[PDB]
């Protein structure tokens, strides 16, 4: 679930640029991003549209940092 929220927040932040997406996550390839989109669209087209509208300020260090923190939190709690 949290990883799903991460793709949604990323694509809000940057749009549907699967290459940059796959680069920023540590072990997700562009093909994985495409497969995830193809799975999720049917139930989350509304969320994709909201994200396209949600042109959130894409800061490099801010997002890298919040990523690292929440990955660490998820790994510890999972």
């Amino acid at each position: 679930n949290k990883e799903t929220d991460m793709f949604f927040l990323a694509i809000s932040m940057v749009g549907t640029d699967f290459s940059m997406i796959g680069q920023l996550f540590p072990h997700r390839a562009r093909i994985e991003i495409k497969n995830k989109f193809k799975r999720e669209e049917k139930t989350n087209g509304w969320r994709i549209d909201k994200a396209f509208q949600e042109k959130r300020p894409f800061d490099f260090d801010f997002f890298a940092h919040l990523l690292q923190k929440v990955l660490a939190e998820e790994e510890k709690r999972k």
Partner: protein, 178 residues
């Protein structure tokens, strides 16, 4: 006559000449849905959810679009991409629209004993089960390539208009039946 099943198109391919120079980096920067990655390939890809399609833009003033179910939908998607490009600041135009390819599929709802078909049509029906489960058949009127499977489904590709897919299906159906 038909078995009551009409071939269903699954993908359409169309392209246009934009008629102006473009910068891949500028489009990638200014567009939400643009993807750019010159280290791998020097082109910009495009996506829209309606019509559900993927397209590419090139600095030479070219566009390709695919994923639509009908040729009019592919033209609509391509015109939407051209509208986006024009509103991005490029003096693009919709020049020389053409359809390149479209894919269809159908079914006959009975088992296909492929060995008989390859034994009666080896000249054109290329069968090989090892690497690929489906049979491959190329026919001439029109210039279409066909894929055939034991379950009775068929995939058709290489056409420009749905009439070609229908004609090919109707021609092959008697061969499929016997």
């Amino acid at each position: 006559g038909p078995s009551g099943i009409v071939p269903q198109l699954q993908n359409i391919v169309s392209t246009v000449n934009l008629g102006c120079k473009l910068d891949l980096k500028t489009i990638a920067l200014r567009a939400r849905n643009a993807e750019y990655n010159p280290k791998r390939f020097a082109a910009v890809i495009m996506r829209i959810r309606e019509p559900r399609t993927t397209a590419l833009i090139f600095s030479s003033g070219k566009m390709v679009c695919t994923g639509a179910k009908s040729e009019e939908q592919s033209r609509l998607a391509a015109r939407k991409y051209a509208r986006v490009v024009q509103k991005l600041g490029f003096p693009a135009k919709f020049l020389d629209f053409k359809i390149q390819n479209m894919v269809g599929s159908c079914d006959v709802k009975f088992p296909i004993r492929l060995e008989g078909l390859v034994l009666t049509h080896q000249q054109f029906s290329s069968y090989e089960p090892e690497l690929f489960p489906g049979l491959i058949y190329r026919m001439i009127k029109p210039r279409i390539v066909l894929l055939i499977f034991v379950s009775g489904k068929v995939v058709l590709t290489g056409a420009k208009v749905r009439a070609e897919i229908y004609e090919a299906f109707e021609n092959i159906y008697p061969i499929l039946k016997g």
